[PDB]
Nucleic acid binder design. Structure first.
Lengths: 338, 197, 338, 338, 310, 339
RNA sequence: CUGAUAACUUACAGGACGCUUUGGCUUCAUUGCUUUUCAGGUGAACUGCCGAGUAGGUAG
């Protein structure tokens, strides 16, 4: 098990988000941010508490009231704008079929068998719908959808012979899974993820654009650059027409549409599909190797799952929920070396 | 078929207007013993300013042209090396046909001249009606003109220092034979008869 | 307590205040400012007194006469203008029910339960009234309200179905809570700030429009920039129709509507709801950790405050006045992790 | 004393004095100036004098007979104009009671007690009558009163419930103090400055309109820009109805209605109320800190000046005259921190 | 002496001389000119201003105002030379009165010296000036070529007693004032040349013009028609002609300056001897060749004052 | 056999594939990349497993969440761009006839005779057709063709008396070998390579230009540097207009056009033409010396291969397949010494 | 009159697979720029007549 050279290539390749300001003229100029310096007050817990008493009298009532400057990047909708237009493109492929490197023709045929048996027994409908529900409900916008009037999504797939798929205000209309099943849109875009995962050298290139109606000069929240170590909030940017513009990530927009993992010990909310099911908010990672429900302890029982996927009927709590996780983990996959 | 005898003002320091004035004054003094309206003026190297240091005399029959330079004026100038004269050369048919017309509407714009025009209009208000109010006139604001490059002529019957001013328009390389005037001319009220330069 | 990773996200999201000069023609122009140079007298105390006696004769009676030239930014109302129109948007959200990061899932329970017990026992009427009174009495204009004839405030809430709630001339009419708490207007828009804070995925967006009637070419006082270290008094500005115009802050109009804290040792004036209770004017901060009434001296005994909110009744002196300060710092919250 | 962070906000806020030309049709246009170039003669001291001898033969009778040209801004009354109308607005508030920043509540409490003692012992009648004798006699025109036939001042106060207050031809009628102290026009508008200085939240706004009758094509003298070093004598101007026009300044007309200081050692003529009693014409300064009657030498004796306001009676030679000056400096200035 | 910041302010404040055309129906329209530029076949603008045809006469309106801004300097810097200069002026006031300078300033107002060239080839011209403060009727000067030539022609009964005094009060009385509104009527011939003031243009004949009743009119300067009524200085070494009161008595049309700093009769050597000039005015009597003729110039230069720094 | 010194030169000389971004105005700028830092999870098997049991009490649930940063070069198409143009040049020559160095005039005459018999008996058609079929279907771009709408390949051959050879939309049209054999220019560029192999001092240069329609700000994948012993994923670059541009390599786009070898024992996928038939997908090399089908078990038999190439008839499965593989190795090869 | 006098270093090459950096913020009090100014057409391009003529012609 784990034959020292085992790697998978990713199956979903999203691109960077582009923020445009649409004016009442229906002309589009790129969103631009500025850098402003601002005066905060001494609010840090470790300026008047050592551990866990009161410090030397250099931090008295006089020196705790001296305002300290920070510097931040401020991005907002300009005054007299109609709405913001967020445009990106995502590409579903079939690179989850064969491993990129295998090293041994014993795990290779095992994994290729396991994909084919999952494809045959319990098809791509569950995963395809889960991946497509948060391409079309604007999860990829992250924080801008909160404190917004309404946001509409229009996407143009390829190959396609018809009219653009349009989900209008996704706050009142589209809430639940069933609500996404309108008669003339949804049933033919789940397909081309099922026949672009299953078939060899299959493809589907969605081009998605969301319109955001925000209140008067409200803040837009893009993605911030790391800066390994006064400046908080240094926004990630690209040049459009010689003007710098805030971007909202390339990997962040991929880590948004892949928040589908709610098949873990209990179930509160979907996590980002990882090997050890890491929750970044509550810093304790659920699905620890100690439980034996992590990726590396499920993969090593692969030979078990090929026996269960050849007889009636797979119990939809231990087997199906683990096959979903296996295949959803092979979809972003790479790399299981040790 | 025309001929010219050029005169060049030699001595390299000369207000060419003051020379060309008296040269055209003696052409004006010419053809009054004989009522002949034949000969042109032909300023050859008329520049942006300062009319050139010579003058050609393109003519008619040529019995006049030679006779035009036998006036005892150009002779009495010649003993001093002021002028140098040529030997009546044929005009080549490949030549520019410029009209040297005295405009005379330049002195309808000077206030001394506009005073005359209003005073005329007031005298011939005897074409009866309302005798027009002389306060209803204005020297515009920007009466702009080009180019007119004036000379310095003077009257002979009266002691009036009148000034005639010549322009440099060019068209239609053949017209009449000739018609001209006392002051040489390319203007006389009917023909725009140009000059072979 | 204070478990090394604990941040809150703010609940109230205000924005920039765009100043618009409005003429008798019913047309609007962006208010413009100009960098004006001027000649002050030698009036600094350090010029003619060294420490703390008398200067030797380089600072004679003639040296204190040559006026020192300054360069400031002057912004005034133009002659023949009708009034000034100040437009900004404020957004109340439900981002105080759960900490952003927690690190320990035993102190998540305490803070979650604490907000639930505060809600059910002593509801959101007090804080919502104190927040909205600052929005509707023109606290966010700061100094333009003084030396003004009359100023009207009209705000459009969302979601809403009726007339824009018009607060007319606010000097004679609305001075106290009971002048605000009258019939047609107030009780309907103090709920929707309760149902914003109380309910999960709750949101209320007010767009506030104020009209100032100042005297003949009176001075407008916007917010000034920091410049971290001649030109003093540089105004913070944004560009409307490619014309620069002063702004009156974004974090300044958040500091304005959250001047509530009059539950502090004595009680003189509403302070800006901070941790160590910094008073910017009288530099000495009330709620110094020596008092034991600051945020960290209140939070580290939260397990006391879960006992008191069960038994009938609660005392409104050293329980409710602390729980108000607690929720006031969870609404502004982030980050108090030590 | 002087506790390193003491500031006061000004208590009199004037405005710019906009010039208008009113024609015999009772229609008004802005007074517009033009920039003309003129040919002066070489009459400078150091063009035929070194220090202070006679030069090399470069100041020969040819050299001092060449006209040196200047370019200056010429503003005059247009031919056929009826009269000139100058208009501004002044605001009397109570921002001298409480200091803006104090830093230490031992000099703050002193100064609030000192204002309260001055108010109750020798009230605001002296400073009110002095500050209103500069607004009502046209001192804020500065130079346009020299070589003028008659100038009438019509001022519209607020709050007010009646007619307008109008002082007619001010060369014959209103010369002395008693000439201003007549029937309908002094007992009622000196009060409302005293109630706007003594009361908290106190306010009194006057809109003042002066009518100048200058002779034919008379030269009008506005204020000038500083231009920190050809074009000398460049006018301060603002735009009215698209046309540029001269303005006479905002800070110049604050130093017109604050030229009340004739309480300086002996007496000559009223100064502008400065710390170091600076005169501009005589470029020496009265109240040089050596004499001990500048601002800081009087301020530091505050605890002395309280004890003199204990019982009857206040001496009108060196206490009333000094406390007048002290309060006159609290009205104007800030900051005196060191 | 010359204490690095010394500035006086002018007492004579003239205005612009607005030209007007009166037609035979008693209606007055502003005199308008035309400007020709020559566009030589592939800038140089010349202006012409003649009196239009059928014009009755030309009105020339301006206002001069005598003030008391020569008692105290505007900036002094040192109050040692201040009381010296205040004492000097009030000594001059008391000893040898303001009659001479007043009459000399009021002659070249009330004879049309300020018209400069527009009096040449003119048949007759009449000057009416309205004074203030005044109590009665307009002071009118009829044809000023035949009637008024010398001083004694001006010193007649019903005019000159009451307008030279009121300039003397306007210089003596602190916060004193006199405002004369002067109006001259030129009877120029049929289509005569008018010569107004010409604008600078650093390197020909473009005039100084202002807009009256929506249309431009030539103006005859403000500092030109002030420099005309102060062509008073003729106390320079000997005498030929009245000059402009400068410091170095500068002549214009001829390009030399009488009263050089070398000759010791210019406003800087005569000034610095003030403390001596206080001596000779203390006791009788001043020799009216080096004292009165210098004190006249000193006071005449104070009325043009500003600045005598360093 | 293998006479201690024996070297062949290259007969296929490819170049660097210069990327250009072309705008709707048809002005071409170079493509540009940037090193952006990013924060990843603790996803490695090393961080939570010894072998193959359970980790020490230092890989705790909190310790497996403190995300670790990396620094990766990111190249993408800029917004509002029309398409991407990729330009390079292949140069076919006649340097497969005689060995560059040989040392012994016994194997030299053998190898020259063997080339001459493979030339006259079997065609250059097979190798030239297999070579040209992946210069003209965009194998030389590797992964840029995948997740791309359409790519068009225009090549300017030399020597040439006429027009430009064009290949339009390559996903529906040019799929199979017959689709290449269609109308006009194909029958002359499978020729002139056989001239470039048959004729002594023969030469054929083909300059190739491909247009790529990628989606809006799509990811572009160039070739990466080695870095032997922090920036993981550093892109190979060159200078255009004094700015750096990603390059896609010389030897990478020579390893693309030289994917002929599908005669290795049975067949799954065409490999790089190596000696021991090394595969990269699975890290086991097919056609290695225990099978006797490597380049040193086939070359030592070269004399035997001559005796079959003279008489009728060569069976097209074992002998012809190995003669193809020999000549595929001779074109690429150098050097067969030991040592 | 050179550590002198002579000198071919060559052949072949796939670095690739995977990634969320984010939470919070009050720059603000005070202000007099002023004093005085010559751009200069020697006389000089005039007076008629025709035109209903601020259109345009023309003599001297």
């Amino acid at each position: 098990k784990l034959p020292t050279n085992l790697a998978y290539e990713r199956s979903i390749d999203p691109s960077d988000v582009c923020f445009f300001v649409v004016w009442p003229d229906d002309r589009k100029t790129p969103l631009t941010y500025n850098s402003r310096t601002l005066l905060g007050q001494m609010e840090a817990k470790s300026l008047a508490y050592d551990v866990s008493g009161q410090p030397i009298k250099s931090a008295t009532a006089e020196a705790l009231a001296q305002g300290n400057p920070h510097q931040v990047d401020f991005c907002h909708v300009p005054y007299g704008a109609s709405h913001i237009e967020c445009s990106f493109s995502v590409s579903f492929s079939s690179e989850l079929r064969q491993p990129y490197k295998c090293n041994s023709s014993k795990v290779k045929q095992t994994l290729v068998q396991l994909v084919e048996l999952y494809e045959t027994k319990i098809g791509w409908t569950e995963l395809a719908t889960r991946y497509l529900m948060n391409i079309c409900n604007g999860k990829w916008l992250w924080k801008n959808t909160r404190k917004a009037y309404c946001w509409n999504i229009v996407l143009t797939p390829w190959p396609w012979n018809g009219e653009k798929v349009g989900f209008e205000d996704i706050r009142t209309n589209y809430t639940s899974r069933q609500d996404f099943k309108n008669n003339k849109n949804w049933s033919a875009i789940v397909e081309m993820i099922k026949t672009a995962f299953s078939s060899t050298d299959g493809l589907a290139i969605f081009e998605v654009r969301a319109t955001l109606h925000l209140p008067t000069n409200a803040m837009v929240r893009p993605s911030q650059v790391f800066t390994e170590k006064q400046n908080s909030r240094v926004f990630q940017s690209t040049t459009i027409d010689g003007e710098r513009s805030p971007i909202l990530g390339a990997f962040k927009t991929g880590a948004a549409i892949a928040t589908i993992d709610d098949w873990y010990p209990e179930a509160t909310e979907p996590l980002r599909v990882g090997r050890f099911g890491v929750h970044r908010e509550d810093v304790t990672c659920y699905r620890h190797p100690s439980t034996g429900k992590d990726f590396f302890s499920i993969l090593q029982q692969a030979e078990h799952y090929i026996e269960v996927l050849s007889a009636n009927k797979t119990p939809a709590q231990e087997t199906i929920n683990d096959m979903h996780f296996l295949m959803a983990n092979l979809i972003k996959g790479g790399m299981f070396q040790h | 078929k025309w001929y010219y005898k050029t005169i060049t003002f030699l001595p390299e320091l000369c207000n060419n207007e003051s020379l060309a004035a008296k040269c055209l004054r003696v052409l004006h003094g010419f053809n009054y013993q004989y009522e002949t309206r034949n000969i042109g003026v032909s300023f050859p190297l008329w520049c942006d300013a300062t009319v050139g240091k010579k003058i050609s005399f393109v003519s008619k029959n040529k019995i006049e042209l030679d006779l035009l330079l036998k006036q005892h004026y150009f002779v009495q100038m010649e003993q001093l090396q002021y002028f140098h004269i040529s030997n009546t050369v044929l005009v080549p048919e490949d030549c520019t046909y410029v009209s040297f017309r005295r405009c005379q509407s330049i002195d309808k714009l000077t206030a001394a001249g506009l005073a005359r025009k209003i005073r005329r209009l007031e005298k011939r208000a005897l074409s009866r009606g309302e005798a027009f109010d002389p306060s209803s006139f204005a020297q515009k604001e920007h009466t702009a003109i080009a180019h007119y490059h004036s000379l310095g002529e003077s009257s002979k019957q009266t002691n009036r220092n009148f000034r005639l001013n010549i322009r440099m328009l060019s068209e239609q390389p053949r017209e009449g034979n000739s018609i001209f005037s006392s002051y040489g001319l390319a203007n006389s009220e009917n023909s725009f008869q140009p000059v072979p330069l």
